[PDB]
Amino acid sequence: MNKSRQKELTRWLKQQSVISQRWLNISRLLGFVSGILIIAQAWFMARILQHMIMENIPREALLLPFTLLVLTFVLRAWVVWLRERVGYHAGQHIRFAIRRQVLDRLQQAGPAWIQGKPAGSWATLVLEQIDDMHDYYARYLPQMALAVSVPLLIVVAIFPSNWAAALILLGTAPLIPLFMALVGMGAADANRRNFLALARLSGHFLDRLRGMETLRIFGRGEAEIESIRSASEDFRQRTMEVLRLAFLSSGILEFFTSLSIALVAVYFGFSYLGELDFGHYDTGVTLAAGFLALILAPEFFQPLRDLGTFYHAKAQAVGAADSLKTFMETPLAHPQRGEAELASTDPVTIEAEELFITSPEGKTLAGPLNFTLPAGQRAVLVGRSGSGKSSLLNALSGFLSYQGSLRINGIELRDLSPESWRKHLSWVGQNPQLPAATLRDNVLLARPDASEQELQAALDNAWVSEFLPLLPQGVDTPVGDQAARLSVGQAQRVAVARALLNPCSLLLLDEPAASLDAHSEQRVMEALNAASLRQTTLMVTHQLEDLADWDVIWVMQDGRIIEQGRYAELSVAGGPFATLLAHRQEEI
């Protein structure tokens, strides 16, 4: 709860409403017109009532007031119908624009920034948090003008008839905003902690569901229910804390509304009897004056009670915007989105000078990397686990920020147009995932309109086509949750089929043949070795015998490339490569 921060969020919330400014002014007009028709409605009602009650005028004589009273009722229902639909149309246009902005920054953020929250926390930030800003735009924004205009208009119709009745309304009017702000001053912070507890419960649920097998194996059924119980218990307590502030504020505002309706009734009832005689312009208090000041007594405080109701929709929006603003402020991998693009589709030349790769938090994942890789040459990344081999491939993909220099064809990577840069990249990642629905939709991820020959050629090269007969629908089978339908080795070859289906300028293989046996690896490594010669290639691998024709071998340790050179030079030169090759074929 920082007032400086909550003022930044309200400023940001108000900025998004400019797209629907015209619709927010029509509802401000229609709300005022409803206030006009309410006054016209009770003026006719008071005149009809006084004529029948006091002057005993027959109903068949009062036909003009009845016709006009019905006409007001028909127009009242029309304006209420228009204002409700106009308010919604403004609200959903702002919500759509806000969500488009958030989804736009998730395309640019990349996996390394999407990994900064649980995937269930993102879902409740795009669906629940954005959709709870609706009542701020649809309801609260038009209500600020109606809470001041209509109540003032109500009492302008009462001063001429009876000033004492209006001072009853004006006497209580300032108390409502004072208690509206006093009660709901902590409502914006309670909503922020309410979405914090929802984002934890949503994010903690989907993480357990995605890793639901490891919970079954270790017998964590009782322990995960208790953790969901605690996560859901906090959400229930945060939700009720938010609601108690809405009920207390609405209860207090209704208390002043009800008493003023009672005071108006008591004042007029006593005035007619002569118990108290003031505020009537030295003329006998008429019955129509009392009825007018009694029908408009609830309607004077309606706009104020709706402002109190919608003031907690504003607190709901401010709490919901606390986490969207944080996301939209944090800088991405590259501070400025690049516009430069390299023209040719020829193999690119990679260069690094004092290149440091850092995590989104700020931790460096690879130390000073000095290397060069000419066009068309292929390199091999080799080293211990945690040495930074995959972090280098993530920085070449544009997923991670880097401090030093990393130039592609002499052009800094931070300056390259990311959308046009990925068109020159194919890759097999460590623990590859299959996003698309089917096996054919996954292999054709790069270009879904590829020919049958080019799809068949990729499936043959990647050894995918041999296990197709086992699949029921063939190449059109679904793959399910986290590629459940396939085994890890079969999912590996489908990921390899993606990389080989389109030509590229830089191929980033990251353990491309994992979860494969001796023979299936050899069949796949024929396709990957052939593909590695068509462009610049850089693979990370633990096999050391099979690689002998690769143009250079990089040995990474603690984020630094400590050796370079061919297999013939490195194998017999000692150093980390020989020691790391010593454990290879140790028993053979």
Binding site: Q92, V266, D481, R493, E511, L580
Partner: protein
Amino acid sequence: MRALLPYLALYKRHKWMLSLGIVLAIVTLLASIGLLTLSGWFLSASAVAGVAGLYSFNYMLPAAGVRGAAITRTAGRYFERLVSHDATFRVLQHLRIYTFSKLLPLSPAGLARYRQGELLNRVVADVDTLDHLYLRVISPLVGAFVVIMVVTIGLSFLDFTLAFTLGGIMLLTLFLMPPLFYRAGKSTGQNLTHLRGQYRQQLTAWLQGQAELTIFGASDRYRTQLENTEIQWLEAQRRQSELTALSQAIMLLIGALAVILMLWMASGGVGGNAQPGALIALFVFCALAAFEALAPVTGAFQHLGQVIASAVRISDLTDQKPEVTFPDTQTRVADRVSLTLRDVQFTYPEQSQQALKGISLQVNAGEHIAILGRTGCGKSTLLQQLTRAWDPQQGEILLNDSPIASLNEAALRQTISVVPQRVHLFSATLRDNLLLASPGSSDEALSEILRRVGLEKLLEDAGLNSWLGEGGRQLSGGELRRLAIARALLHDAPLVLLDQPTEGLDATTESQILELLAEMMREKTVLMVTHRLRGLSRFQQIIVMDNGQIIEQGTHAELLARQGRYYQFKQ
């Protein structure tokens, strides 16, 4: 609408608190009609009496009536909300925990029939949708029926035609308009529940695959598919707004009809007299105020088509029978485990061919077994049979010469340690990622197993208190692999199923890990699956699989001499 019965029955745990909210919702309404109705009569009766009425007109009783009704109106509504919202969100919290408890028994195969993004929507979003059922369906409907009867009966003493005309309109609107708006908004509500879960699934799938989608240029056309769902979702959201707008417009016209009718009919005569006087305002102001009892009535049934759609989702999830069920008999975990398989067969759900075809092997207590084969030959399927992920068809598995289906689950999980092929890093801290197995382990024990497995790096900085997984530090591929081994080494079970434990590990780490496993996993039954033929000379039996069947079997020396399929693997 019959799908709401399992959820209306959740009233019974909060029957007093939820029925108290109904009573307070009637007292609040009754005081609300009274305040405007008393004021309307009090003003008209006071004016008719005039100055001469003083000293003869009891004006103190109505003066206390409006003061009493004003306090009752504001206090009752506040306490109704406090007591009705408190009970509603205790029911929703119990129902959310209940829905989550149905997930683990369905974990291997039941959850595969579902989508992971819509399962999240069912537990956190569809459960919250049911607050409409407990907050604004029962209390408004039965609150608005008792109030009308009280108003109609009370107004019946003064006149009969007037009371039944006002009460008739008030019931003809309570009984005809809600079902009309339930039917009108039934189709929209179904879409509105279905499209929210479709969007949350497509969004989470799009967020989880952002590495693969971004580089292959598929994020743009998966966001277009994602954006389209929102267009359809926002369209269904708009239709529910047009019905709410039409609900308020119609409800305002019905209240207009009651006010017009009372003015036109009470003036003719109230109770049989030509000059009703103050009684004209007694009926007009009642009809002017009685229709706030029907304010939430129409919206109660309109949003019911979306609540029923949500209720079917939870009902579908909680009506799933798990495929694997466990005995309740308590048993002690043995110290030695020897497993026997006899013609185990298994077909995956919705499949024709068999993943396992007549597998039979005998693993003695303390023997170390290595399983080998091509990819897709059923190596992990075999290891998940031993974990009771599925029930084998026409096959029998035996642990210590007793069926594996005769073990208590709390005893089956304590007698088997598994290193899965795919490791999962939970979002919890490093300590809680290691406390899945051996929850009673101390911090000194946790740190020691990390040093042995080569993860002494994780002890730096925050260390054990460091947040891992999504929202924290993400370990590398070879560091997840050694964290799974750390989990199984902490579990310390007699039977250990290793599914490619040394995968994605360099030669130095694999040598250190294999050296650790040999020393750590002594006098332990081990079924070590790898595609790596290193260190197989120390395994009593080597099993070679192909297409769900065991092809070869023997010691490392025997298999090389026979020059079987293991020979081409090695050479």
